[PDB]
Design a protein around this ligand. Structure first.
Ligand SMILES: Nc1ncnc2c1ncn2[C@@H]1O[C@H](COP(=O)(O)OP(=O)(O)O)[C@@H](O)[C@H]1O
Ligand SMILES: C/C=C(\C)CC/C=C(\C)CCC=C(C)C
Lengths: 760, 970
């Protein structure tokens, strides 16, 4: 057989069983091949466009395609510039979702195939499926990489960026998932799914730095991911990884993630721990159960009731529908991972379950259900009964997602397309090649982690540089690095606020959050100047924790250890240890000098460091060019401020209880007789309540005297006062919320509240 | 390139971004018309992206660095995005494309406006007059051009070909126009605009040539006039010049441009058309329509649109020029925002200054209103600037070489293959010297009738997924059935339409076939503008042989021998084997065809039939109407022997009988809707019966074959043997307009009944006989002999009574003098109207008809040319022109509607008195039994002291004497 004949076989199957159904208008493919349903699901269209693109990737190996490469590729662009249209019309929702990711602010995931309009509402359907926004972005990168031009103007690039700002914060947005129901229980509940976070980690790894314009592209067409938000997704997937979610210890949606298309997991032991549970607990003769205790189109499921009631989930144990598609994903995984006998084992399993249409074209039935009469026999001896197909194709019903995966798997298995061809962005990294892949693997490899962070000791003043030199540490004042500009992280957050700003689509820009230690560890070219950012550890704060130098030295060690464990980008990380004259004041000098000295020795906390001059450290380094700032509306470039040289009691005697029963101006009396900054905080804190925010004090507004006592005992290191002060003035740290997410990303749950009192 | 050409390119980039690309919707790619008009017009979107496409082309011809590649890619993909958005706008209306494909109704047309945020529809079908063939045609044209420039599913290809079928019948489809208001009167009346026809022709040429050359016929006939109700439209620049270039006549293009400049061009642009009143201070802003009496008000104060001067820079760039006067005159640009030109939509005479502008035309300082910037005009302004400053070339915007239309195209040599149907026929052809090949020998080339070709195209364009059903069955003329076709790897050649149509008497006459072949060759030699050389397959059938069968028809031999000699039909012809013509033919490939009295009891009255064959037939109408497909009681029915009678009289070729049998059996010409559509295609109206007015039902617009045929039948009022004459004469007029259209000049309303009557009169005076026996011998004429009579009727060739014959010939042909209609416009200014036979042509018509309209012509020809008698009419024509003659010398105006007939008669009564006295027989001059006008008055020459026109001058002067008591003549 010639290649033309070998691939005309797939073009007949693709054209009859997939591209016939593509909407002439939207480009999206319909979920129901035959019928009046107008639903086009987002995920199924992406898998359908990928199937046409896989045939184009095959027809690229024939020069006389007879037009079939342009049509099959341009069908894929049609579907992908149709999902973009559906999303671009709902960009009022992309702005709302960046700011408040929630089940009822999401981009809809089911649209009218004919018109692109919203079909089912938030009540009717769970539209929060971030597997879909995330696979749109993985497929847009994988298709634009192939040569397929899907993004056409700067406004489409700004929407893809705003789509990225949404896909970054997936770790904190629980969703419904590929299966649209949430958990095994259809309680209408969203949960974090390794599958949705895993596809987001993959879209973000693929789209960071990607010209959406392809070869015909410049700096102003690149998408920029947050290295810190991507880390938070990597941390979440890893914490939850052998499993899918609180509810599912295994789901077959993990197979699309762990392997084609995302190829997300970067641990070979977790991939095997995740795949083995999926194959062992979910494989079947007719396919893979989506999840154990699944009621989809089961004989025992009630058709009328949308939501399974508690303990119903037991009735579906052994009756679970088995989806033949998962056999096709396992065959694609085998072609990618070089197992020529996992392709055969699962090809052999699919040849029997595959129906054929009247013209002989293969139909992959969506699910194989146990017929109602045989449910008890299967439950008694699972794997014994014969399950009827869900779609036979002759019925007029075809699973368009499965039809597309047959084309991808059959082409990959027959070697008519290559693993490299369908993963232009290299999502699968073979083990031997897991070395220098950005955001995933570092030169050292997959297992070794002795990163040398490139420290640069920057001193607030020349006075402090000369003082630090006398005591042994060469530091550089902000001016001595003249072309390089040292910026607070907040000044990068201001610059990023101009990324993705489209006023035509109502989009605003990066949400105003803190850039963290994996984004302040990068050298940036912003408006023609080189900007290096001091870490957020060095940012001044109202909270009293800042005063302890030992906590600063520990936050410096803690940050460098995070940079070591989680920085997998090409350059060496750049940590700038800003030293402020307050840091060396008093006996803080001895602790700071030991940190600064260890940074000079090359090790602080097990993290090897190379202190050196910023000019030498920034020299051949990769610089992220922030080209989105431009001039934009204002004919002036934005105004960015950069760090500049700052040129020159034993116990409180007053107990709260015995001194609060008094309402007296006498609390204002002891206030004049309390030298304790803890008695003052207790006495001048009873009054922030009973007399008011401004009840006049001898000193002035009470709000000013507690902030004076809090600040004063903060310096005098009088910690009972600093804590009565912080509390009385109700002080909260910016970091409480960022840290409470470490607990959550790691599968832990924090309870705040005292012991013996109301917990939350 | 960045030294001094990249900076200016960036300046134009800012221009396009801040005028056009700023308003492009990121979701749909469409462009809203303005802030107030948030909807996206198809034509405005297509035109507004031309600047972006040109900038992308500019950027690319100099794209070497990345950044420049990024800008070029962004511009090209913005153009692609806009066109795709317009596609999904049309794709969502596939049910309308499919419906308009067969039934070209305004209620089944693609919408002009679309929601710029969802590619959906904003208003209802009833709410905007959406039928605009120019918008869809300009979209198709620029889709073809952009693709030929490198700008990139099959389902949308099928949709695009269905759109090709949609705009395919635009030469005969009424339109709402480029200005989406139909006719000028502005009552939502769909009208045929040459702008739409030219744009459709350009789109079809860029993307079946038969309807293309039909559109070409519409363009030639209509230009320099725009449509029926428009003397000239400034939108014609979009046809005679960029972007369509649909007129290949350089003289016609120059004449259209000169008409636009002379009539519409003003100090602030060109008015769209005379008496437009789109944004004039005289209209009612909140009233959608226009009363017919306020169109005068709009005269000399129409809004001048700067958009049309962008067309005058574009031509001038496309055709090299010092029309750098059109530029430098566009200093009338709004802002010099920052300094952005912001080309306005129109300039309106300030309201106070209406009287000054009316009186002194193109002189008042108008104000800018409407859209600002006019993105359709702004894009053309930027494109013209780009092209004029050397950053762009005509060959980049026009990669299909549409600009080379005007160049004279050489005569084409039509290769003809004469093919023998049978081998015996081949033997006869050889004895006589024409060496041919049989249809069997021409294998593997398969010869098929043109019906099969028309049916094959019905399978082109079909996707049942989106409910698109091929192409409607359209008759393929000589142009379509002259290319060779590659269907399933075997070459198929198709004989012309006129050969397989053997259902009417025309095919029995071999001379007719010769004449049809000659007309087809003449049409081919002029209208073939296709790659390849056209190939007419001419098989000689057994019916083409003589009576004996051992010899071929003389006429057919003579035609074949002339074709062998290289010339026949005004065309150079090369005859040869069809196998030789493969390498130099338009071998198009059809890839869609690949698989994958007393005694009223009529018991015994037909017994008399059981040999004159005339009488046998005569009885047969008594037995048809009284008794058509009913029984005869001898294993026979009325229709059967009438068909047997028809065959018998065809064998004996006694043509009177064939015609009668055909007439009572209701034989109808299949390609008769084609004949009527061709005659109306040349801006000629048709009327179908005997001349008194109600019977003579006029044909102002094309009619479907069923209606046309039904109109013919009711126009005979049951009087047989004219209903067939109407079809036969219509066919002959169509052939003569295809071949010798000069013969049809100064003719605008073909009266078939009057034509038939004048042919009878000519057969009465030539071969002198009674007018009646001549009316019967007209039946017995061969179809080719009757066509010859018609030729001689038209050209006035002859095989003291002459002047009556001429007056008759010209009146029956409805021939008007050159400039007659404009002269009638002039008298209507003086008088209150003309009255012919009691029907009034009011002066109020001029208040809504500019003099050169072909809608005022029709108004005049419906009040004047309706006169039954052929001559009375030609006299009424004189009395109008002598009224026109004397209106100039007369210095005053009269408040009467002048009855022209009276002037004709007063001249009649003045003809008795003068001739009697000069001394002539009282019986020498006798009155007409129809008109009451002396026969000798008709026989009188026009000029002279006793000329008929002199008598009307002595009559009109004696007619307006009581109306105009005093006449201070010049
Ligand atoms: N004040 C802070 N202290 C510590 N880490 C912070 C602080 N602010 C932000 N971060 C870190 O910066 C990254 C991104 O910031 P942000 O969007 O605020 O994170 P999150 O949404 O997890 O709270 C996270 O890794 C977060 O933990
Ligand atoms: C000066 C008088 C004549 C030359 C006699 C003929 C002219 C008329 C009878 C009136 C013409 C004026 C019109 C408005 C028709």
């Amino acid at each position: 057989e010639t290649l033309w004949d070998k691939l005309d076989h797939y073009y007949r199957i693709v054209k009859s069983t997939l591209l016939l159904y593509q909407s002439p208008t939207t480009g999206l493919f319909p979920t129901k091949t035959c019928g009046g349903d107008q639903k086009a699901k987002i995920q199924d269209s992406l898998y359908c466009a990928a199937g046409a693109w896989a045939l184009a990737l095959a027809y690229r190996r024939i020069d006389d395609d007879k037009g079939r490469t342009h049509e099959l590729e341009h069908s894929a662009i049609k579907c992908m510039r149709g999902i973009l249209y559906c999303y671009m019309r709902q960009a009022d929702k992309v702005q709302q979702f960046k700011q408040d990711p929630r089940p009822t602010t999401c981009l809809h995931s089911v649209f009218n195939v004919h018109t692109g309009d919203e079909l089912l509402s938030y009540e009717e359907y769970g539209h929060l499926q971030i597997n879909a926004v995330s696979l749109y972005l993985l497929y847009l990168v994988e298709m634009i990489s192939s040569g397929l031009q899907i993004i056409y103007n700067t406004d489409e690039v700004s929407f893809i960026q705003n789509l990225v700002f949404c896909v970054e914060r997936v770790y904190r947005v629980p969703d419904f998932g590929v299966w649209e129901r949430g958990s095994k229980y259809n309680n209408g509940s969203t949960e974090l799914h390794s599958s949705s976070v895993g596809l987001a980690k993959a879209a973000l790894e693929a789209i960071n730095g990607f010209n959406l314009f392809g070869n015909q592209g410049c700096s102003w067409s690149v998408i920029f991911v947050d290295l810190d938000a991507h880390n938070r997704n990597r941390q979440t997937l890893c914490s939850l990884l052998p499993r899918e979610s609180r509810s599912h210890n295994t789901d077959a949606a993990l197979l699309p993630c762990i392997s084609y298309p995302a190829f997300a997991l970067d641990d070979e032991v977790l991939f095997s721990q995740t795949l083995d549970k999926v194959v062992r607990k979910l494989k079947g003769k007719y396919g893979f159960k989506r999840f154990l205790r699944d009621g989809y189109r089961t004989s025992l499921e009630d058709p009328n009731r949308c939501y399974y009631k508690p303990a119903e989930i037991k009735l579906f144990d052994g009756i679970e529908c088995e989806f033949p598609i998962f056999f096709l994903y396992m065959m694609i995984d085998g072609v990618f991972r070089g197992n020529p006998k996992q392709v055969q084992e699962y090809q052999d399993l699919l040849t029997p379950v595959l129906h054929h249409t009247t013209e002989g074209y293969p139909v992959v039935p969506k699910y194989y259900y146990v017929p109602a009469d045989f449910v008890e026999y299967e439950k008694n001896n699972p794997g014994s009964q014969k399950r009827f197909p869900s779609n036979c194709g002759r019925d007029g019903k075809l699973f368009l997602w499965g039809q597309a995966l047959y084309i991808i798997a059959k082409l990959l298995a027959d070697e008519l397309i290559s693993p490299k061809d369908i993963d232009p962005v290299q999502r699968y990294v073979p083990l031997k090649d897991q070395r220098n892949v950005s955001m995933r693997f570092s030169n050292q490899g997959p297992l070794e982690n002795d990163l040398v962070v490139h420290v640069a000791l920057i001193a607030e003043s020349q006075r402090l540089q000369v003082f630090l030199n006398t005591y042994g540490i060469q530091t550089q004042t902000p001016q001595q690095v003249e072309p390089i500009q040292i910026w607070p992280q907040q000044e990068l957050v201001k610059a990023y606020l101009q990324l993705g700003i489209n006023e035509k689509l109502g989009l605003s820009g990066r949400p105003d959050r803190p850039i963290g230690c994996l984004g302040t560890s990068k050298i940036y070219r912003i408006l023609g100047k080189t900007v290096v950012c001091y870490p957020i550890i060095f940012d001044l704060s109202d909270f009293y924790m800042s005063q302890d130098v030992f906590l600063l030295i520990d936050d410096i060690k803690n940050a460098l250890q995070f940079i070591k464990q989680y920085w997998k980008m090409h350059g060496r990380p750049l940590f700038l240890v800003l030293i402020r004259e307050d840091n060396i004041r008093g006996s803080r000098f001895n602790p700071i000098l030991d940190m600064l000295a260890a940074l000079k020795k090359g090790i602080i906390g097990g993290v090897k460091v190379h202190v050196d001059r910023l000019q030498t450290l920034i020299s051949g380094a990769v610089v992220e060019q922030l080209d989105f700032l431009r001039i934009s509306d204002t004919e002036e470039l934005p105004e960015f401020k950069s760090f500049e040289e700052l040129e020159p009691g034993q116990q409180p005697d007053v107990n709260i209880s015995e001194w609060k029963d008094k309402p007296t101006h006498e609390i204002l009396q002891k206030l004049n007789d309390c030298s304790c900054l803890a008695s003052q905080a207790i006495l001048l804190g009873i009054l922030l309540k009973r007399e008011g925010p401004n009840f006049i004090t001898k000193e002035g507004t009470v709000s000013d005297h507690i902030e004076r006592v809090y600040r004063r005992a903060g310096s005098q290191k009088l910690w009972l006062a600093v804590r009565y002060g912080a509390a009385f003035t109700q002080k909260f740290s910016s970091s409480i919320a960022p840290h409470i997410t470490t607990f959550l990303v790691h599968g832990k749950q924090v309870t705040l509240g005292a012991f013996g009192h109301e917990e939350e | 390139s960045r030294s001094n050409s990249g900076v200016r390119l960036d300046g134009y980039a800012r221009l396009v971004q801040q005028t056009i690309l700023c308003h492009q919707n990121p979701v749909t790619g469409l462009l809203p018309a303005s802030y107030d008009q948030k909807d996206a017009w198809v034509r405005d979107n297509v035109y507004s992206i031309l600047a972006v496409w040109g900038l992308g082309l500019a950027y690319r011809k100099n794209a070497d660095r990345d950044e420049d590649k990024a800008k070029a890619y962004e511009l090209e993909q913005s153009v692609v995005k806009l066109m795709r958005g317009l596609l999904h706008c049309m794709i969502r209306q596939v049910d309308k494309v499919e419906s308009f494909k067969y039934s070209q109704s305004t209620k089944d047309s693609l919408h002009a406006k679309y929601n710029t945020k969802t590619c959906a529809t904003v208003v209802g079908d009833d709410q905007w007059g959406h039928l605009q063939l120019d918008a869809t045609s300009v979209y198709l044209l620029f889709l073809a051009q952009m693709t030929a420039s490198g700008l990139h599913s099959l389902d949308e290809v099928n949709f695009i070909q269905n759109l090709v079928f949609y705009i395919e019948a635009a030469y005969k489809t009424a339109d709402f126009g480029i200005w989406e208001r139909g006719d000028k009167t502005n009552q939502g009346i769909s009208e045929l605009n040459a702008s739409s026809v030219g744009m459709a022709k350009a789109a079809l040429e860029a993307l079946l040539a038969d309807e293309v050359q039909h559109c070409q016929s519409i363009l030639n006939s209509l230009l320099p006039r725009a449509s029926t109700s428009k003397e000239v439209d400034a939108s014609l620049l979009s046809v005679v010049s960029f972007p369509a270039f649909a007129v290949e006549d350089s003289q016609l293009v120059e004449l259209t441009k000169q008409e636009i400049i002379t009539k519409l061009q003003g100090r602030y642009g060109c008015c769209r058309f005379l008496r437009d009143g789109y944004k004039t201070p005289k209209e009612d802003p909140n009233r959608l329509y226009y009363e017919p009496a306020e169109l005068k008000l709009f005269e000399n104060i129409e809004c001048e649109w700067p958009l049309f001067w962008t067309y005058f820079i574009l031509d001038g760039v496309f055709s090299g020029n010092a029309e750098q006067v059109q530029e430098y005159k566009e200093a009338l640009e709004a802002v010099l925002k920052n300094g952005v030109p912001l080309l306005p939509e129109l300039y309106s005479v300030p309201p106070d200054r209406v009287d000054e502008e009316y009186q002194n035309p193109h002189t008042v300082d108008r104000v800018p209103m409407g859209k600002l910037p006019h993105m359709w005009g702004q894009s053309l302004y930027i494109l013209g600037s780009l092209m004029a400053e050397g950053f762009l070339a005509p060959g980049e915007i026009d990669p299909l070489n549409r600009r080379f239309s005007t160049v004279p195209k050489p005569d084409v040599v039509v290769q003809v293959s004469i093919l023998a149907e049978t081998e015996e026929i081949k033997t006869i052809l050889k004895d006589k010297g024409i060496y041919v090949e049989t249809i069997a020998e021409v294998y593997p080339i398969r010869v098929q009738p043109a019906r099969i070709l028309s049916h094959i195209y019905s399978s082109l364009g079909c996707n049942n997924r989106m409910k698109l059903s091929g192409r409607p069955y359209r008759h393929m003329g000589v142009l379509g059935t002259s290319k060779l076709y590659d269907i399933r790897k075997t070459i198929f050649t198709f004989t012309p339409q006129f050969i397989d149509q053997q259902q009417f008497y025309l095919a029995l006459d071999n001379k007719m076939i010769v004449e049809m072949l000659r007309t087809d060759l003449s049409y081919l030699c002029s209208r073939w503008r296709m790659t390849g050389q056209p190939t007419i397959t001419f098989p000689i059938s057994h019916s083409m042989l003589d009576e004996d069968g051992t010899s071929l028809n003389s006429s057919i031999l003579a035609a074949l021998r002339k074709m062998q000699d290289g010339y026949f039909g005004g065309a150079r012809v090369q005859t040869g084997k069809l196998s030789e013509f493969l390498t130099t033919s338009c071998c198009t490939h059809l890839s869609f065809m690949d698989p994958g009295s007393g005694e009223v009891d009529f018991k015994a009255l037909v017994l008399q039939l059981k040999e004159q064959a005339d009488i046998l037939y005569m009885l047969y109408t008594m037995k048809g109407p009284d008794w058509t497909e009913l029984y005869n009681e001898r294993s026979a029915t009325v229709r059967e022997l009438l068909t047997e009678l028809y065959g018998k009289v065809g064998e004996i070729r006694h043509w009177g009988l064939i015609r009668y049998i055909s007439g009572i059996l209701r034989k109808k010409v299949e390609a008769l809707d084609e004949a009527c559509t061709d005659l109306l295609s040349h801006q000629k109206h048709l009327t179908v019966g005997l001349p008194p007015e109600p019977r003579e039902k006029t044909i102002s617009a094309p009619l479907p074959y069923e209606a046309l045929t039904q109109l013919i039948d009711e126009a005979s009022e049951g009087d047989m043997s004219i209903s067939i004459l109407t079809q036969e004469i219509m066919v002959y007029l169509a052939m003569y307009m295809r071949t010798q259209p000069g013969l049809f000049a100064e003719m605008f309303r073909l009266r078939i009944g009057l034509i038939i009557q004048v042919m009878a009169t000519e057969l009465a005076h030539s071969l002198r006989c009674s007018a009646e026996e001549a009316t019967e011998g007209l039946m017995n004429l061969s179809p080719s002999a009757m066509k010859n009579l018609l030729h001689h009727i038209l050209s006035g060739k002859e095989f003291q009574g002459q002047w009556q014959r001429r007056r008759r010939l010209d009146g029956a042909l409805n021939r008007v003098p050159v400039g007659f209609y404009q002269k009638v416009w002039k008298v209507l200014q003086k008088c209150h109207g003309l009255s012919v036979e009691g029907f009034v042509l009011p002066s109020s018509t001029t208040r809504e008809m500019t003099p050169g309209e072909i809608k005022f012509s029709v108004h005049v020809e419906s009040v004047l040319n309706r006169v039954p008698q052929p001559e009375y009419r030609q006299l009424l024509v004189e009395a109008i022109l002598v009224l026109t003659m004397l209106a100039d010398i007369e210095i005053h105006s009269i408040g009467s509607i002048i009855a022209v007939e009276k002037i004709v008669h007063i001249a009649n009564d003045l003809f008795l008195q003068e001739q009697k006295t000069l001394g002539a027989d009282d019986t020498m001059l006798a009155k007409d039994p129809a008109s009451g006008i002396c026969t000798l008055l008709y026989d009188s020459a026009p000029s002279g002291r006793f000329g008929t026109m002199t008598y009307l001058s002595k009559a009109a002067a004696t007619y307006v004497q009581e109306f105009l008591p005093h006449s201070i003549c010049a």
